[PDB]
Write an enzyme that holds these catalytic residues in place. Structure first.
Site, PDB file in Angstrom:
ATOM      1  N   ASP B 143       0.838  -1.194   0.000  1.00  0.00           N
ATOM      2  CA  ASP B 143       0.000   0.000   0.000  1.00  0.00           C
ATOM      3  C   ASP B 143       0.878   1.252   0.000  1.00  0.00           C
ATOM      4  OD1 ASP B 143      -2.247   1.714   0.038  1.00  0.00           O
ATOM      5  OD2 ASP B 143      -2.863   1.148   2.072  1.00  0.00           O
ATOM      6  N   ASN B 148       0.366   7.279   3.111  1.00  0.00           N
ATOM      7  CA  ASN B 148       0.948   6.377   4.094  1.00  0.00           C
ATOM      8  C   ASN B 148       2.378   6.768   4.465  1.00  0.00           C
ATOM      9  OD1 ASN B 148      -1.328   4.627   4.335  1.00  0.00           O
ATOM     10  ND2 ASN B 148      -0.804   3.826   2.302  1.00  0.00           N
TER      11      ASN B 148
HETATM   12  C1  LIG Z   1       0.946  16.261  13.307  1.00  0.00           C
HETATM   13  C2  LIG Z   1      -0.112  15.240  13.751  1.00  0.00           C
HETATM   14  N1  LIG Z   1      -0.746  14.597  12.574  1.00  0.00           N
HETATM   15  N2  LIG Z   1      -1.741  15.266  11.934  1.00  0.00           N
HETATM   16  C3  LIG Z   1      -2.141  14.478  10.920  1.00  0.00           C
HETATM   17  C4  LIG Z   1      -1.405  13.268  10.915  1.00  0.00           C
HETATM   18  C5  LIG Z   1      -0.506  13.358  11.980  1.00  0.00           C
HETATM   19  C6  LIG Z   1       0.457  12.392  12.418  1.00  0.00           C
HETATM   20  C7  LIG Z   1       1.768  12.718  12.806  1.00  0.00           C
HETATM   21  N3  LIG Z   1       2.673  11.807  13.236  1.00  0.00           N
HETATM   22  C8  LIG Z   1       2.255  10.467  13.286  1.00  0.00           C
HETATM   23  N4  LIG Z   1       3.176   9.559  13.718  1.00  0.00           N
HETATM   24  C9  LIG Z   1       0.936  10.070  12.896  1.00  0.00           C
HETATM   25  C10 LIG Z   1       0.049  11.046  12.473  1.00  0.00           C
HETATM   26  O1  LIG Z   1       0.610   8.732  12.968  1.00  0.00           O
HETATM   27  C11 LIG Z   1      -0.532   8.151  12.272  1.00  0.00           C
HETATM   28  C12 LIG Z   1      -0.829   6.725  12.726  1.00  0.00           C
HETATM   29  C13 LIG Z   1      -0.510   8.289  10.744  1.00  0.00           C
HETATM   30  C14 LIG Z   1       0.521   7.562  10.124  1.00  0.00           C
HETATM   31  C15 LIG Z   1       0.659   7.569   8.729  1.00  0.00           C
HETATM   32  F1  LIG Z   1       1.652   6.891   8.164  1.00  0.00           F
HETATM   33  C16 LIG Z   1      -0.224   8.292   7.911  1.00  0.00           C
HETATM   34  C17 LIG Z   1      -1.248   9.003   8.525  1.00  0.00           C
HETATM   35  C18 LIG Z   1      -1.397   9.002   9.932  1.00  0.00           C
HETATM   36  C19 LIG Z   1      -2.527   9.773  10.365  1.00  0.00           C
HETATM   37  N5  LIG Z   1      -3.682   9.258  10.854  1.00  0.00           N
HETATM   38  N6  LIG Z   1      -4.427  10.351  11.121  1.00  0.00           N
HETATM   39  C20 LIG Z   1      -5.794  10.249  11.671  1.00  0.00           C
HETATM   40  N7  LIG Z   1      -3.833  11.548  10.841  1.00  0.00           N
HETATM   41  C21 LIG Z   1      -2.624  11.204  10.353  1.00  0.00           C
HETATM   42  C22 LIG Z   1      -1.604  12.188   9.923  1.00  0.00           C
END
Ligand SMILES: CCn1ncc2c1-c1cnc(N)c(c1)O[C@H](C)c1cc(F)ccc1-c1nn(C)nc1C2
Ligand SMILES: CCn1ncc2c1-c1cnc(N)c(c1)O[C@H](C)c1cc(F)ccc1-c1nn(C)nc1C2
Lengths: 275, 275
Positions: B143, B148
């Site tokens: 994916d 991602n």
């Molecule tokens: C600045 C805060 N932030 N704001 C948006 C997102 C992150 C964010 C920042 N750091 C992360 N380690 C994080 C999200 O982890 C999740 C599990 C994540 C991973 C990923 F590969 C792709 C999208 C997401 C995601 N899932 N949601 C619901 N949102 C986001 C993006």
């Protein structure tokens, strides 16, 4: 208060690359200018057997740069004044002059410029700070233009700083009072700073492209100003416009210029994150 | 070799902001994860009273990220697995997901994007390195898409790094073998990586904008590919094109993908300075 220029052993300095004429200007290396080891420098020379007056002007430059001490003002690292040619040792600005840096950013790819609006605004902030300092040091530059500033880095990704240097009729940069009456004030500097930030915002275009040098004064004295840069933020156009008020005392101060710029930047950054 | 997830005292963790659903995902702070003090983290939860299978999948994720250790792969800082909800503690990527970061870069000003070609190429290099690592760790992601990945910084001036995360039919990202036969190899990953770098180069456009989901397979299986991004460097188009070879073994390896990208970058940087 007896002034003292920073002397540096000539033996340690090695010229390597000619840059041009301005004496001439060279790139080279110099040992322990700052433990430091071998660090790169620019060297401004004074041509052998030049006029007695020419030697006095050269020393005037040196004194000015000794006094100045500000992040956005070019540093003079040393002087070699005991032998001919005379050397003024400058910190090397790998980005070259601002005008070149801007042009290389534009004409690098049609995909788009390598400098963004935020990058450009940060350039204006840098100079404006420099101009504020010089004003506080009661100094009128009288040739504010992109050609007379320098950039710290060659690349367009690494963090960068601009600095004012250079301490022919540049008609396109000259305030109406200067051309007609030979008046030169901080307020006429504000006119030029106006033209400068236009240069930055157009990535190093020539002011008044449709006009010969002989036509510039004509065009200006009828209220003719530069055309706005493509997509130029309104807030920045309003600043530029006021820099070119016909009445000198209708122009903003450098303090206010820095205010506007930082405020605009703050606003713009906020608008990014809020989207 | 008995695997061990990194346990972190739950008491030290404080949730602060909800980000969405994916359990749910939160932003928060955590004490001495890394002396460290109070540092910001993302927290992936497992919804209370979820299926027994759902809890196994959640732990599979955790194990994968414990094993992985690479600059361009998202770090798992801790786990809180003794109580409900279960917590996977991730390093906070302030730039959010790559797809968002790209879009905010484009739709920030019509003056022009806040990401330049060099910035974008560096994004591709980052992922490609990540993909090379995962390949060496015998892992097929299945994916690969901008949604991602995550970006280290919110701003567009500060140095940045991208990292792969996420360890519905995404038809637009799927290789022909995957759609028709349910085949998933490293070579089918190369197809998706192709689509990804298209996403990067178009600043987060939707692939196949003229096609419904039902029409994508049709269009592809007749040899229909994406249209080139505006002004896309030829060298990069040739790479993308080869990523989408109909025959899987006619596609390049991730090693070669990284070669091309760095070489292109080297070339482009040289062309700047030589001008
Ligand atoms: C600045 C805060 N932030 N704001 C948006 C997102 C992150 C964010 C920042 N750091 C992360 N380690 C994080 C999200 O982890 C999740 C599990 C994540 C991973 C990923 F590969 C792709 C999208 C997401 C995601 N899932 N949601 C619901 N949102 C986001 C993006
Ligand atoms: C990377 C090498 N480099 N390459 C071009 C230039 C510099 C350069 C870099 N660092 C300096 N301290 C430097 C030049 O000093 C001179 C005196 C200079 C000052 C200035 F305000 C505006 C233009 C020049 C200039 N004069 N020539 C003939 N060229 C240049 C720009």
């Amino acid at each position: 208060s007896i002034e003292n220029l920073p002397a540096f052993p000539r033996e340690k300095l090695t010229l390597r690359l000619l840059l041009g004429s301005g004496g001439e200007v060279y790139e080279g290396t110099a040992v322990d200018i700052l433990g430091s080891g071998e660090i790169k420098v620019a060297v401004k020379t004074l041509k052998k057997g030049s006029t007695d007056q020419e030697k006095i002007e050269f020393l005037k430059e040196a004194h000015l740069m000794s006094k100045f001490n500000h992040p956005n003002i070019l540093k003079q690292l040393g002087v070699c004044l005991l032998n001919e040619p005379q050397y003024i040792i400058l910190e090397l600005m790998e980005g070259r002059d601002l005008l070149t840096y801007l042009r290389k950013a534009r004409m690098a790819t049609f995909y788009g410029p390598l400098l963004t609006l935020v990058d450009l605004v940060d350039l204006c902030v840098d100079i404006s700070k420099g101009c504020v300092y010089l004003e506080r040091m009661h100094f009128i530059h009288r040739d504010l233009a992109a050609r007379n500033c320098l950039v710290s880095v060659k690349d367009y990704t690494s963090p960068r700083i601009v600095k004012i240097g250079d301490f022919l009729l540049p008609v396109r940069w000259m305030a109406p009072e200067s051309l007609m009456d030979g008046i030169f004030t901080t307020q006429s500097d504000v006119w030029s700073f106006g033209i400068l930030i236009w240069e930055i915002l157009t990535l190093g275009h020539q002011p008044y492209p449709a006009h010969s040098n002989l036509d510039v004064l004509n065009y200006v004295q009828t209220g003719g100003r530069l055309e706005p840069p493509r997509n130029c933020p309104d807030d920045l156009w309003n600043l530029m416009t006021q820099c070119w008020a016909q009445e000198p005392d209708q122009r903003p101060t450098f303090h206010r210029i820095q205010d506007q710029l930082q405020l605009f930047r703050n606003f713009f950054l906020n608008s990014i994150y809020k989207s």
